[PDB]
Amino acid sequence: SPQCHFDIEINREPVGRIMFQLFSDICPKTCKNFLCLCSGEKGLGKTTGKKLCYKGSTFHRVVKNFMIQGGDFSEGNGKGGESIYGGYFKDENFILKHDRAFLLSMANRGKHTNGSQFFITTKPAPHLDGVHVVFGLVISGFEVIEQIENLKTDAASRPYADVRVIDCGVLA
């Protein structure tokens, strides 16, 4: 099972590393996208012209007791990002359920609109089953997730503080 990490700073304070386990058996296309966004190895986005990489991206949507969301590397507000395939790719499958906290799952705007945005749940969310593709699990950095989850947000659930992926990468 491949692994990859984010190193997080909040307002430039280093707060720790989130380590992900990806389930590339069940969701190979989805995990390959997420992995390549961690290494940045695929270069410039085909529809966005921005680097296909999470490094320097933010968490732009936070809902306490629900989830934290990031990966919009082109707009930082939920409107952007795209996959390594060029624009969006199909919902690979909905085999894995949102049956626990700390799952990694694809953000979307309807069927088959997977790009680069992802979210991490902080509780079971079964109403999302068959809606968002689950492809991974956080296996370390729970305190980081907690910290991000408790940030003050505005009316659009956007954190006021800078929640920054300062580094990220694929593990051996």
Author numbering: 6 to 177
Show passages lifted from the paper.
Cyclophilins are peptidyl-prolyl isomerases (PPIases: EC 5.2.1.8) and are characterized by their ability to catalyze the interconversion of cis and trans isomers of proline. In order to understand the molecular basis of these results, we sought structural coverage of the entire human cyclophilin enzymatic class. We determined crystal structures of seven human PPIase domains—PPIC, PPIE, PPIG, PPWD1, PPIL2, NKTR, and SDCCAG-10. All cyclophilins share a common fold architecture consisting of eight antiparallel β sheets and two α-helices that pack against the sheets. The active site of the cyclophilin family includes the invariant catalytic arginine (Arg55) and a highly conserved mixture of hydrophobic, aromatic, and polar residues including Phe60, Met61, Gln63, Ala101, Phe113, Trp121, Leu122, and His126.
In addition, binding of CsA or derivatives was seen for PPIF, PPIG, PPIH, and NKTR. Modeling of either CsA into the active site of a histidine containing isoform (like NKTR) or computational mutation of the Trp121 in a PPIA∶CsA complex structure indicated that similar hydrogen bond distances can exist between the indole moiety of tryptophan or the imidazole ring of histidine and the carbonyl of methylleucine 9 (MLE9) in CsA. Therefore either residue would be competent for binding, as we have shown experimentally. Conversely, a tyrosine modeled in the conformation to coordinate with CsA created a steric clash with the carbonyl of MLE9 (1.75 Å); in addition, there was a close steric conflict with the modeled Tyr residue and Cζ of the highly conserved Phe60 residue that helps form the proline-binding pocket. Consistent with this, electron density for Phe71 residue in NKTR indicated that alternative conformations are possible for this residue, which may also explain why the PPIA Trp121Tyr mutant was still capable of coordinating substrate in vitro. For instance, the residue that is at position 103 in PPIA varies from alanine in about half of the cyclophilin isoforms to a serine in PPIE, PPIH, and PPIL2; an arginine in PPIG and NKTR; lysine in PPIL6; asparagine in PPIL3 and PPIL4; and glutamine in RANBP2. The occluded set consists of the cyclophilin isoforms with bulky sidechains at the gatekeeper positions; for instance, NKTR has Lys84, Tyr93, and Arg114 compared to PPIA residues Thr73, Lys82, and Ala103. Indeed, for NKTR there were relatively few tetrapeptide combinations with both favorable predicted binding energy and penetration into the S2 pocket; this is easily rationalized by the extremely narrow gap between the gatekeeper 1 and gatekeeper 3 regions in the NKTR structure, which occlude the S2 pocket and restrict the types of residues that can stably associate with the pocket without steric or charge clashes.
